[PDB]
Every structure is written in C-alpha cells, then in structure tokens.
Amino acid sequence: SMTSHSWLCDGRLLCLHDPSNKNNWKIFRECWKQGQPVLVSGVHKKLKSELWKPEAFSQEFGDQDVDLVNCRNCAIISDVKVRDFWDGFEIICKRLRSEDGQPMVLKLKDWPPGEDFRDMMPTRFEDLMENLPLPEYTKRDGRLNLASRLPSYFVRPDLGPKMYNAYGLITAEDRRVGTTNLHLDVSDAVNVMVYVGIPIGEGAHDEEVLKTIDEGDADEVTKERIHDHKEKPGALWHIYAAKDAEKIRELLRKVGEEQGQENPPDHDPIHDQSWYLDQTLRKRLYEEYGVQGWAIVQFLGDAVFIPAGAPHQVHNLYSCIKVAEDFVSPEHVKHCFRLT
Ligand SMILES: CS(=O)(=O)NCCc1ccc(F)cc1
Ligand SMILES: CS(=O)(=O)NCCc1ccc(F)cc1
Ligand SMILES: [Cl-]
Ligand SMILES: [Cl-]
Ligand SMILES: [Cl-]
Ligand SMILES: [Cl-]
Ligand SMILES: [Mn+2]
C-alpha cells in the first residue's frame, strides 16, 4: 500500500515517498531541525528522461575541453574532449586505459564549469528546478531559502545547480576509494540521482556491489530494496552530524601521524578533502571516538538532503549522473556566519 514515508537507518533517516506532496514539510521540518539528513524517493518519475541520458550529453557538448580525474590514484587527465568521458560511461570497451592496460574509473571535473549550468543547459535547468522536493527550502526564491536575503556577514552559495558525473568503482581494491572524499559545505544541499548506468563488457559485476553495500554498514531495509523491488543503486554515502566534525578531525590527525604525514597540530583534514573513511577507519571512529554516521544507498531518482556543516563522502557503485542545488535554511544558518 502507498504511504507518506518510512524510517530507515535504525529509525534515524526519514524517507519521503511522494516528491511533490504539498504536506511534506509537516514530516520533514522536525527531522531537519535536529540536524539529520533526509531522503526523498521518486524524483526520476517527475523528470523528462530524454534530457538526462549520457548519449545526449555527448552529442550536444562532446567538443568541449575538460579535465578528468583517475579515481584510483588521483592522477589528472588534462585538456581532453568531454566525449572521451561520455562515450565510455556505460560501455567498458570504449573507456580510456591506464598504463597497466585496464579500463579507468574516471570522474568528470567541474562540468558544466563554475556557475554556467543554466546558460549552457536551459531546458535541463527548468526540468530540475521545477521538480525539486521541499520547494520552499530548495528553489532560489523559496520562502525558507535565505540565500538571496543575507548580508555579507554570511557566506552565500554560488548560483547552481552543479552536475557530478563519474563511473562506478569496480574491484575489491576499489572498495577503499571515494568518488568524492570526506568534506563539508557551509550551505545546505539537495543532491538528485537523475541517471544510473549499469554496463556491458565486464558486465555481470553484481557480487562486488553487494559486498560493498554490506561492508558499508547499510541497514536491512535498504538491503531489501536491492533484492525485492529491483531498483538501480547508484552510490553509497556516509554522512556524519555537524556536531561530530571535530572528533573526526582528531581521528584523521592521529591516522595522518601514524602514516608519517608531517602536519601541524591544528591542520584541517576535512577541509583538505584528502581522506575516504574505509571500513577500518569507520570502525575506529565508532570504537575510539564514539561517533556513528548514516550509511545511505542513493538509488535512481533519490534526493539526498545534506545539512550544512555535516561531513560526508560518496562512493559510486555504478556510473552516476547527479545534480545538486545549494540553499540556506533558517534551521542551519549559524554554519555560514563569519563571526564567533
Ligand atoms: C597515456 S597513459 O595513461 O600513459 N596510457 C598508455 C597508453 C595506452 C594504454 C593502454 C592501451 F590499451 C593503449 C595505450
Ligand atoms: C549504520 S545505519 O544503518 O546508517 N544507522 C545509523 C543511524 C545513526 C546515525 C547517526 C548517529 F549519530 C547514530 C545512529
Ligand atoms: Cl546544526
Ligand atoms: Cl538544455
Ligand atoms: Cl516545502
Ligand atoms: Cl574528492
Ligand atoms: Mn558536498
């Protein structure tokens, strides 16, 4: 039977089921005020699916010059055509290869660049912005988005949205690598999964995805969406409460020292965006510092709401297209204030 919502992550994660319901705010706002992330399912059913295909991006924009990142070793591939990324998104035999002869796991850096999404892609901009959940919070001019209303005493987000495109991580060794390393943002954000590409070539790669979700500490209800409903899983997130950010800095300064890094005692390993918390480091955070987090699997059409100041990391299970909008809720405006 159809329901307004469910509770995931041992009752700590709200999952809203109807992305456009005019009553969603009544369920959302108490979870949000407590500094929790929120998930909203079903946004893909509201969008024009033809606008969000990898082959369309290659056809329309493929002669633009871009830089790529090799997710395995952080090497930068400079000044290549964006078609060289898009044409290997789902077809493994078309992917750029490393010196060892293997196909690379690539991330497309800063594309569209800076604030240019709306100018470059006006039909995509309209389709996303008109279908964002919790629109009083997430639209540029929503009544509960303070972004356009604050003075210079507050850090204001850039004009959005921003697109995040990267291949899926594949191997047992890849389990310890991030798509996006641990970091935080001083603004709130909503991140929508608009497309998931499950390949052919090395295709039949299902078992390493299940071990990644299990070892990732997914809850048993999330482990049912995999097996029961046959939805496409895109990415595994870990999110930590803003109140636990300094305890995470203390762990990563200790581990940096154990690994012979030579950092000053006040340096900021979260701002550096250089760490991915693997199973070993997540268990040490829990056991040695008493800090737990939310393990979230983002399926096609899921919107993840990330509270301002909350440390988070992302690991793609399959090839993903994500689109994110930043906003400034009144609940979390303290995190962007420039004094005290
Ligand atoms: C430019 S590179 O990143 O150093 N790679 C070496 C070139 C290559 C690697 C694998 C091939 F199947 C063909 C050529
Ligand atoms: C591993 S999980 O299935 O995501 N459940 C964790 C929920 C939780 C989140 C944050 C906390 F500070 C304490 C508990
Ligand atoms: Cl907060
Ligand atoms: Cl467009
Ligand atoms: Cl709303
Ligand atoms: Cl990163
Ligand atoms: Mn972020």
Side-chain angles (χ1 to χ4, degrees), residues 1-47 49-58 60-142 144-155 157-333 335-340:
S1 291
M2 181 64 183
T3 57
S4 59
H5 64 285
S6 55
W7 305 103
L8 296 194
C9 300
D10 307 312
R12 305 278 254 107
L13 180 67
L14 173 62
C15 181
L16 291 161
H17 301 161
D18 175 1
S20 54
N21 204 282
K22 67 176 138 48
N23 302 285
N24 275 342
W25 69 274
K26 294 182 188 173
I27 311 164
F28 179 84
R29 70 172 183 156
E30 181 153 331
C31 296
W32 193 242
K33 89 165 155 254
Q34 294 173 24
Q36 304 183 334
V38 177
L39 187 146
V40 183
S41 65
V43 181
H44 61 304
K45 298 169 179 166
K46 303 296 199 177
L47 296 176
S49 64
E50 66 273 13
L51 297 177
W52 302 107
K53 290 178 167 291
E55 306 92 327
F57 292 122
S58 189
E60 301 172 38
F61 310 109
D63 292 335
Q64 292 183 27
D65 307 305
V66 294
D67 294 352
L68 312 182
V69 183
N70 177 340
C71 299
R72 294 188 171 119
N73 67 11
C74 295
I76 294 170
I77 300 137
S78 293
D79 197 35
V80 297
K81 296 303 192 188
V82 78
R83 104 155 34 73
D84 294 2
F85 173 83
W86 289 114
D87 285 8
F89 189 79
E90 276 174 274
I91 306 172
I92 288 173
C93 70
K94 290 182 142 191
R95 291 177 178 188
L96 296 180
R97 299 185 174 259
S98 40
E99 286 269 40
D100 66 357
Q102 293 300 107
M104 287 184 294
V105 178
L106 299 168
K107 173 163 70 162
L108 176 56
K109 186 195 267 214
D110 189 25
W111 190 80
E115 304 180 321
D116 302 348
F117 189 110
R118 181 177 193 172
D119 286 339
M120 184 179 297
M121 300 183 174
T123 305
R124 273 95 173 178
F125 176 92
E126 190 183 22
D127 198 50
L128 177 82
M129 293 308 206
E130 287 295 308
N131 291 287
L132 284 182
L134 286 300
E136 293 203 318
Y137 288 98
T138 62
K139 294 190 71 163
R140 288 183 165 191
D141 73 343
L144 298 178
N145 181 5
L146 306 189
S148 75
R149 299 189 187 100
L150 291 169
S152 295
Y153 291 93
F154 300 86
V155 177
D158 291 338
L159 293 160
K162 283 292 289 173
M163 212 182 168
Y164 295 97
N165 309 297
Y167 298 173
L169 284 157
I170 294 172
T171 67
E173 281 179 20
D174 292 336
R175 199 159 296 149
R176 302 184 62 268
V177 175
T179 300
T180 299
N181 284 343
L182 191 76
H183 70 291
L184 69 77
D185 296 301
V186 300
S187 310
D188 299 307
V190 54
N191 180 299
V192 184
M193 186 72 68
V194 298
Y195 188 92
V196 180
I198 295 174
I200 47 145
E202 269 92 63
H205 152 279
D206 207 299
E207 279 101 63
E208 41 251 268
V209 169
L210 298 183
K211 182 58 163 189
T212 294
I213 289 162
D214 176 37
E215 200 188 319
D217 202 27
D219 73 78
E220 23 288 293
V221 195
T222 298
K223 278 185 195 147
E224 283 164 24
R225 275 175 102 176
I226 297 286
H227 300 112
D228 282 21
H229 297 294
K230 347 292 197 157
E231 295 188 70
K232 299 181 168 168
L236 170 69
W237 292 68
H238 298 91
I239 307 181
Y240 304 85
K243 71 178 179 49
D244 290 325
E246 192 56 27
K247 300 308 180 187
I248 293 160
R249 293 187 194 97
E250 292 174 359
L251 169 70
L252 297 179
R253 290 177 200 120
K254 178 163 68 158
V255 176
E257 196 189 60
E258 287 164 1
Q259 300 183 355
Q261 297 189 3
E262 186 59 70
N263 294 128
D266 71 322
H267 125 280
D268 189 346
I270 301 176
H271 186 265
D272 283 356
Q273 201 156 164
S274 61
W275 294 89
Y276 182 77
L277 311 182
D278 69 349
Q279 190 178 43
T280 302
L281 288 179
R282 294 185 307 265
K283 185 79 179 320
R284 228 165 128 188
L285 181 57
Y286 183 101
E287 297 284 309
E288 296 171 26
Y289 297 82
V291 174
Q292 171 75 119
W294 292 265
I296 304 174
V297 179
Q298 185 184 25
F299 289 78
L300 175 67
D302 286 349
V304 177
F305 284 72
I306 306 98
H312 61 284
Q313 61 181 30
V314 189
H315 174 103
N316 286 8
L317 298 163
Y318 288 116
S319 292
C320 296
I321 309 185
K322 318 191 196 75
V323 185
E325 180 75 1
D326 289 346
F327 63 96
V328 183
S329 69
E331 293 81 349
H332 303 144
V333 73
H335 294 277
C336 67
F337 188 50
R338 289 185 187 272
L339 295 164
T340 119

